[PDB]
Amino acid sequence: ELERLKAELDEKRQIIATVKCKPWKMEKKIEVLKEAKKFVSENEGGNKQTIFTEEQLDNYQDCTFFNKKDILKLHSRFYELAPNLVPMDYRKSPIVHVPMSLIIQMPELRENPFKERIVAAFSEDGEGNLTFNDFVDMFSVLCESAPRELKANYAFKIYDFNTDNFICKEDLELTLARLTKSELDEEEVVLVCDKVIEEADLDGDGKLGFADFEDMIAKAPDFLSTFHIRI
Amino acid sequence: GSEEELERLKAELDEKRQIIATVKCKPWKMEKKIEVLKEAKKFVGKGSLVPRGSNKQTIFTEEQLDNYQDCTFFNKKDILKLHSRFYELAPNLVPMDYRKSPIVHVPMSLIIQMPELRENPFKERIVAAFSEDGEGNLTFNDFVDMFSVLCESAPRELKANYAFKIYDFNTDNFICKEDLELTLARLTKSELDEEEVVLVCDKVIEEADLDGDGKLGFADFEDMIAKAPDFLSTFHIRI
Ligand SMILES: [Mg+2]
Ligand SMILES: [Mg+2]
Ligand SMILES: [Mg+2]
Numbered sequence: 001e002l003e004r005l006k007a008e009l010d011e012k013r014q015i016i017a018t019v020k021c022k023p024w025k026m027e028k029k030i031e032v033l034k035e036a037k038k039f040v041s042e043n044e045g046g047n048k049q050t051i052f053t054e055e056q057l058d059n060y061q062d063c064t065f066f067n068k069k070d071i072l073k074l075h076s077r078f079y080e081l082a083p084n085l086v087p088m089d090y091r092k093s094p095i096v097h098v099p100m101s102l103i104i105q106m107p108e109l110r111e112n113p114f115k116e117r118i119v120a121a122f123s124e125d126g127e128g129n130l131t132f133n134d135f136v137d138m139f140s141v142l143c144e145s146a147p148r149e150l151k152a153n154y155a156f157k158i159y160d161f162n163t164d165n166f167i168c169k170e171d172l173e174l175t176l177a178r179l180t181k182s183e184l185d186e187e188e189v190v191l192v193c194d195k196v197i198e199e200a201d202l203d204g205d206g207k208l209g210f211a212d213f214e215d216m217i218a219k220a221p222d223f224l225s226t227f228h229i230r231i
Numbered sequence: 232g233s234e235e236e237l238e239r240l241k242a243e244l245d246e247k248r249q250i251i252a253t254v255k256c257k258p259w260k261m262e263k264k265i266e267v268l269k270e271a272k273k274f275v276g277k278g279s280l281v282p283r284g285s286n287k288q289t290i291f292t293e294e295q296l297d298n299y300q301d302c303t304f305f306n307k308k309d310i311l312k313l314h315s316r317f318y319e320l321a322p323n324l325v326p327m328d329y330r331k332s333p334i335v336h337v338p339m340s341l342i343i344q345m346p347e348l349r350e351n352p353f354k355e356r357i358v359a360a361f362s363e364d365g366e367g368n369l370t371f372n373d374f375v376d377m378f379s380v381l382c383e384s385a386p387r388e389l390k391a392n393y394a395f396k397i398y399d400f401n402t403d404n405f406i407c408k409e410d411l412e413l414t415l416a417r418l419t420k421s422e423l424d425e426e427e428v429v430l431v432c433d434k435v436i437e438e439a440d441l442d443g444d445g446k447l448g449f450a451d452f453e454d455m456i457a458k459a460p461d462f463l464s465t466f467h468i469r470i
């Protein structure tokens with residue numbers, strides 16, 4: 001049975017190490033991390049600051065692709081967006097929402113043609129009124145250390161303009177038009193969209209599910225270029 | 232490396248199993264025993280969604296019955312029996328449903344009237360010993376702890392833990408000749424004179440006391456119990 005505890009311990013470790021790769025909200029990632037870390041502890045027997053506790057910085061490091069210094073930079077960047085809403089002491093996990101208009105004005109998102117949709121996808125309500133946790137989530141997914149599949153999950157939601165849980169040719173037309181605003185003519189986008197959708201739609205509905213969309217991203221990788229942003 | 236790791240896991244597993252098996256032997260309150268047990272127990276049907284193995288009572292949950300069994304020397308039928316005994320003592324106060332863990336205290340005066348305690352010369356002190364306040368107003372948890380300590384399956388050391396306190400009339404964390412004189416006079420139920428009690432107690436303390444103060448600590452009291460086990464006849468009660 002020692003083998004069974006040793007296997008479960010290893011599974012927990014895998015969970016601990018890959019929660020940052022999950023298309024999940026910060027609070028879900030932290031809850032799963034804590035549970036896995038508890039199993040492990042019960043069976044195995046950088047410059048002071050006052051914005052975050054060390055626990056919450058550790059949790060942020062474990063649930064994102066960022067270091068503790070990065071988190072404190074992101075805090076300053078969020079504060080700058082709304083200095084009269086954003087608290088300077090997060091130690092008691094205060095909940096504050098900054099409006100989408102303010103977030104999208106940031107230099108990192110200003111020029112992105114899917115900025116509003118990127119921001120909304122990291123909100124539970126779909127309105128883009130982000131907390132700090134949502135803001136960290138967004139830039140963790142958008143960073144260069146994040147896996148392609150994480151970006152693809154968000155990309156699938158962000159490019160689903162008709163909100164049907166599918167990527168059709170109408171969805172892809174609006175997407176590629178924004179991605180090629182001065183590259184492809186309203187009439188060449190149609191052709192390219194058709195070709196992609198058809199080589200990827202195996203069930204004959206003209207609509208892509210997540211798995212088919214993933215395959216369509218492996219080929220045509222430039223659909224994920226929107227989701228490479230450095231903060 | 233791994234040899235070390237596997238060894239570290241084996242030891243943690245074995246310690247957890249030992250803790251689970253011996254919480255019932257501990258002079259602890261029920262709530263503490265259940266907490267330690269819970270922390271240690273973690274880790275350690277084909278054509279039906281019904282588990283094959285086969286709610287005959289509405290007084291306790293099965294989880295409560297499991298905890299009682301693991302934290303005492305009683306089985307589940309014994310626990311249901313103890314409840315009916317507790318109820319009989321105060322039928323208008325004791326709940327018939329304990330599933331939502333209600334907190335109810337029965338007065339000492341009512342508990343010491345039990346046939347199993349009435350003739351015990353230390354009945355008040357025994358009941359008080361299983362109360363957090365020292366007044367003997369017992370919950371069912373306290374009543375179960377008391378009878379688990381007094382049952383025949385309970386080890387000598389657990390009984391001795393409580394005896395050390397109950398015979399400490401002067402509450403100094405020691406057993407002296409004065410404590411023992413009061414104890415032996417009660418234990419002898421007037422079979423001995425005052426003078427005889429003094430003489431027996433003097434010799435007993437002198438033979439067990441190893442530090443010269445004429446007062447026994449737990450260790451010296453344990454030895455004294457071993458040589459004279461009738462001091463522990465008070466703590467053998469069957470329900
Ligand atoms: Mg769609
Ligand atoms: Mg399809
Ligand atoms: Mg004393």
Ligand SMILES: [Mg+2]
Binds near residue numbers: 443444445447
């Ligand atoms: Mg002494």
